[PDB]
């Protein structure tokens, strides 16, 4: 369909998951800092 073999899909999934986890970690750190500064709940 998209012209990707099995190995290419495996590699893309691996790097996609790693990058998504790093981005979510940055988001979590920023939200922890915001809660420390200005709690909203």
């Amino acid at each position: 369909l998209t012209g990707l073999t099995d190995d290419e899909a495996k590699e893309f999934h691996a790097i996609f998951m790693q990058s998504m986890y790093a981005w979510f970690g940055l988001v979590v750190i920023a939200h922890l800092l915001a809660w420390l500064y200005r709690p909203w709940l």
């Binding site: 998209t2 990707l4 899909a9 495996k10 999934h13 200005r38």
Partner: protein, 52 residues
């Protein structure tokens, strides 16, 4: 297990250009929704008022 096959259905490039544009339009929205509330940090006169 076999979730990596989701890339044999969807197109990586369109998925990557759709995540970027959505998260920049979400970021600009969630920053203007918290500036119209009692949590504004720019017009709160803390640390000191500068036009006065």
């Amino acid at each position: 297990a076999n979730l990596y096959k989701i890339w044999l259905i969807l197109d990586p490039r369109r998925v990557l250009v759709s995540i970027v544009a959505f998260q920049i339009v979400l970021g600009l929205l969630i920053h203007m929704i918290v500036l119209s509330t009692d949590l504004n940090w720019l017009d709160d006169n803390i640390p000191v008022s500068y036009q006065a």
